[PDB]
Design a protein around this ligand. Structure first.
Ligand code: Q69
Ligand code: Q69
Lengths: 304, 304
């Protein structure tokens, strides 16, 4: 027993990290097969970031301007192309450490692990959620650009995120591995509004189930609610509306604990209206929404 | 910016995980050079755990009874010895993936990453602290025995913990890599008291500094305190007494922020006496003590 904010083992991703330098800018790249992927702003100087014309800036670069180093060894760049906000540098050597992988575009509310890197070197790994407003609340310093987010299913790494920037509010924005931003963001040094965020209701419910499984049950009550009634409360507290699709994915947790989804909704409704009254759930004094129902099942069943 | 409960990249440790089976019991082992380390209770059946005589149980085992598999390949066991609560199985092949490593016995209040494993396969990684009472609050299911805790300094992995058991209270106990338990615990299926735990004061202060660095400053006040006065408050709230050694290790954070350690103590004193008043600090509604001053400096400076 016990329930932690667990990240995937990062080894398979560590083997893909490289450093990419272009001019005086250095950031991280992801070396999979014979291609290195990195944020296209590696071609910018500080003055370029105000309003970069990436097509013109990239035209001034040749293959030999992209310096790619995998730890201590240098990669030879034989091609370069821009796809959306990512640069793809074709190298003459396939990464011998390339794991089985896929590129996926995750949905808001889904979770993933981030391998924070600097200068091509891994510093740490943490789990986070893609907020409903397509930002992430990560831990990224200058030079963390190019660090990636991923999930792992047995031997396959599904890369879902590449870090690009920090908004003036301190939250983070990035792209899928095809270089498409999550959210309305553009790779430019301009103030940009992130939408109104909400709490991921299905994840809070999943975490309440994890709490019951692991022994924290004080919040269980004698009440029930309906999807309609619960959604009036969810609206008032800036929670995502719960749908039958969310109830369906909570089914395994409802079956394991014997607590009907709408009964757990009534516990969550009471917690929203009354707070925790100085108590904690799974070591938290707030309602946690960074665990999906799948994360709860995986951790509670020991999936490797 | 941003501050997360970050674990070390687990790759170097993943390469050392093996499965160890003896009779009908299977758990994890750590393969470093030509030795595999694992909890000695791998030699017990369920009936043995009530009061095991490990010396007698181990006498019934020979090298060929210890089945060690590193992923898909089998290791040949050429020796076995018990050291405290760990078994050391000498194998005929040195682990080609052995990183530079050390065995360290950590102090209470220090932090480390755990690579949760099942059947020799890594499932996840998380950061935690060794509680002042020598327990850890981890996420461990049956078969997680043998999973290890570690810290990494550039290329060196310092292994500090090997998982052995879950107390009836749901907290976890284990040993250093020489098989000495942290705390008063014995490897037996008997109810065992963990001491009164306390909150790691120096870590809470370090985390308050991380909050100021990352923009959360609402808790800063116009007050100061003394070590003596603060320690009266620490005693009342079951916090560890603060010493000048703790003030000394907070020095870099005090210098960076310009907030004297005793001034931060007065903020912590006010938070203990008044609570958070429905506010949060670094996404938490309670006072976090799983970040050491070194963790805060490392994360705030991007150490790889
Ligand atoms: C990773 C990062 O923050 N990069 C910096 C440039 O170093 C940046 C600023 C503004 C926008 C973008 Cl896309 C990146
Ligand atoms: C890892 C674990 O919990 N092991 C179990 C036996 O499978 C155990 C029970 C009681 C004491 C000890 Cl040391 C281990």
């Amino acid at each position: 027993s016990g329930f932690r904010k667990m990240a995937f083992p990062s080894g398979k991703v560590e083997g893909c990290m490289v450093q990419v330098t272009c001019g005086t800018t250095t950031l991280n790249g992801l070396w999979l097969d014979d291609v290195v992927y990195c944020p296209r702003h590696v071609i910018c100087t500080s003055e370029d970031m105000l309003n970069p014309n990436y097509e013109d800036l990239l035209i001034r670069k040749s293959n030999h301007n992209f310096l790619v180093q995998a730890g201590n060894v240098q990669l030879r760049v034989i091609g370069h192309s821009m796809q959306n906000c990512v640069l793809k540098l074709k190298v003459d050597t396939a990464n011998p450490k390339t794991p089985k992988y896929k590129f996926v575009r995750i949905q808001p509310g889904q979770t993933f692990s981030v391998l924070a890197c600097y200068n091509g070197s891994p510093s740490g790994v943490y789990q986070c959620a893609m907020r409903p407003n397509f930002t992430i609340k990560g831990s990224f310093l200058n030079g963390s650009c190019g660090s990636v987010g991923f999930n792992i299913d047995y031997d396959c790494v599904s890369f879902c995120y590449m870090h690009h920037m920090e908004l003036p509010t301190g939250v983070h924005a990035g792209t899928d591995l095809e270089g498409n931003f999550y959210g309305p963001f553009v790779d430019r040094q301009t103030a940009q509004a992130a939408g109104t965020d909400t709490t991921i209701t299905v994840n809070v419910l999943a975490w309440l189930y994890a709490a019951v499984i692991n022994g924290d049950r004080w919040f269980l009550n004698r009440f029930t609610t309906t999807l309609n009634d619960f959604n009036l409360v969810a609206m008032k507290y800036n929670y995502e509306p719960l749908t039958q699709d969310h109830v369906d994915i909570l089914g395994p947790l409802s079956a394991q604990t014997g607590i009907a989804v709408l009964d757990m909704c009534a516990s969550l409704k009471e917690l929203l209206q009354n707070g925790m009254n100085g108590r904690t759930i799974l070591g938290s004094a707030l309602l946690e929404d960074e665990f999906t129902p799948f994360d709860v099942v995986r951790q509670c069943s020991g999936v490797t």
